[PDB]
């Protein structure tokens, strides 16, 4: 028997000690080796409640990634709280690796295996494990990249769907590749992402159909972000250490609800830090072909308020609270203390 509890987790990974890549280096010093023979016990006739929106595992993962980025990605200039901090900003090797979150003695992680579990409420198929799956700490806005897919139907997750101020996590059940490149040989900050339009519009149509199930069959309309920092109004992510900002206007096209969709992107040196601490300025992009091919596995949306009088609901890509990114991966886990 057990009870819900918070405690300090540890991390495990297959990081390489000879690698200079920054996630590898961090994990080599902050994590332990993985278990080659992990035990997972199905709990017969046990129903457990989960709440992904109140899960201290998320805060702990956030603390880790902040620590990793603070040690590994210091900028040439940092503008924070009115002060100016200057330091060396060498180019790095950057490519996220899976990190497992694990409980210490006397604790265990319960895992919800209900395929269509929305993240809050009872779960009928529960197992216990010592560690989560390997979660890559991919920082992005608008689109969730390289995450885990929903096993059955597309899932809409929100702390409170009725409250337009709460971000919606759309959990996709089928990956759509996004292929971003800053071509080798001109404007060195100019880039672009390519997406199969036939595949993407198929998925967006399905997302629309799911949203209709939640919003009483009202007409579902997508619109560009209405304002805010560039990190939010654009799909931002890090590719090989460089900060990409991509215009997603073409991705959320109501008309298509079949060719190649090419989003215009730019590598930015000056950034609003997701840690919420201010601005960071980095050096110009490395030479050559900068390329990242990722799976879109989720979408972060915000719904327009005040459309209750209408027959429409309007959605705009969003994000910016990176805790939501971790939430999208940790939603099926909770820590309990064994009594």
Ligand X SMILES: N=C(N)N[C@H]1Cc2ccccc2[C@@H]1NC(=O)C(=O)Nc1ccc(Cl)c(F)c1
Q: Is 330 in the site for ligand X (CB under 6 A)?
A: no
273-302: contacts with ligand NAG (CB under 6 A): 292-295
Question: In degrees to the nearest 10, what's the CA dihedral of 250, 252, 253, 254?
Answer: -170
Which residue's structure tokens are 């949203």?
211
Q: Which partner in ligand X, ligand NAG, none is near 243 (CB below 5 to 8 A by kind)?
A: ligand X
Q: Which does 132 bind (CB under 5 to 8 A by kind): ligand NAG, ligand X, none?
A: none
Fill in the per-residue mask, 101 to 140: x = in contact with ligand X (CB under 6 A), - = not in contact: --------------------------------------xx
What span, in angstroms and rounded, lies between the C-alpha atoms of 309 and 241? Answer: 46
Is residue 226 a contact point for ligand X (CB under 6 A)? Answer: no
Shortest Å, Cβ 300 to ligand NAG: 14
Cβ 159 to ligand NAG shortest distance, Å: 8
Single out the segment in contact with ligand NAG by CB under 6 A; choices: 85-93, 168-176, 279-287, 311-319.
168-176
Identify what 233 binds: ligand X, ligand NAG, none; CB under 5 to 8 Å per kind. ligand NAG
146 binds, among ligand NAG, ligand X, none (CB under 5 to 8 A by kind): ligand NAG
Closest separation in Å from C-beta 67 to ligand X:
16
Contact 295, 177 (CB under 8 A): yes
C-alpha to C-alpha distance for 89 and 77, rounded to whole angstroms = 9
Closer residue to ligand NAG in complex, CB, 37/83: 37
What is each CA distance from 214 to 210, 217, 219, 313, 327, in whole angstroms? 7, 8, 12, 11, 21
Site string (4-43) toward ligand NAG, x via CB under 6 A? ----------------------------------------
Contacting positions for ligand X (CB under 6 A): 139-141, 229, 231, 236-238, 243, 271-274, 276, 320-321
């Amino acid at each position: 028997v057990w009870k819900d509890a918070d405690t300090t987790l540890f991390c495990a990974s297959d990081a390489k000690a000879h690698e200079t890549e920054v996630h590898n280096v961090w994990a080599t010093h902050a994590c332990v080796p993985t278990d080659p023979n992990p035990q997972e016990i199905h709990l017969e006739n046990v129903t457990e409640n989960f709440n992904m929106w109140k899960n201290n595992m998320v805060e702990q993962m956030q603390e880790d990634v902040i620590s990793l980025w603070d040690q590994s990605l210091q900028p040439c200039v940092k503008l924070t709280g009115g002060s100016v901090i200057k330091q060396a900003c060498p180019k790095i090797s950057f490519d996220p690796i899976p990190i497992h979150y694990c409980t210490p003695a006397g604790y265990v992680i319960l895992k919800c295996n209900d395929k269509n579990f929305n993240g809050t409420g009872p779960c009928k198929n529960v197992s216990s494990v010592q560690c989560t799956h390997g979660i890559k700490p991919v920082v992005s806005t608008q689109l969730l990249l390289n995450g885990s897919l929903a096993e059955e139907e597309i899932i809409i997750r929100s702390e409170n769907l009725t409250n337009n101020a709460k971000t919606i996590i759309v959990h996709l059940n089928k990956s759509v590749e996004i292929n971003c490149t800053r071509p080798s040989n001109g404007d060195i900050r100019k880039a672009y992402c390519e997406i199969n339009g036939t595949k993407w519009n198929k998925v967006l149509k399905q997302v629309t159909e799911k949203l209709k199930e939640h919003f009483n069959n009202k007409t579902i309309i997508f619109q560009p972000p209405s304002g805010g920092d560039l990190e939010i109004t654009m799909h931002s992510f890090n590719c090989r250490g460089e900060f990409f900002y991509c215009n997603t206007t073409q991705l959320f096209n109501n008309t298509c609800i079949n060719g190649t969709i090419t989003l215009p992107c730019k590598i930015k040196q000056i950034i609003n830090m997701w840690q919420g601490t201010g601005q960071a300025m980095y050096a110009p992009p490395i030479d050559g072909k900068i390329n990242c091919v990722s799976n879109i596995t989720g979408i972060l949306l915000t719904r327009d308020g005040g459309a209750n009088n209408t027959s429409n609901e309007t959605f705009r890509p969003g994000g910016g609270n990176i805790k939501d990114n971790w939430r999208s991966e940790l939603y099926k886990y909770k820590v309990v203390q064994i009594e």
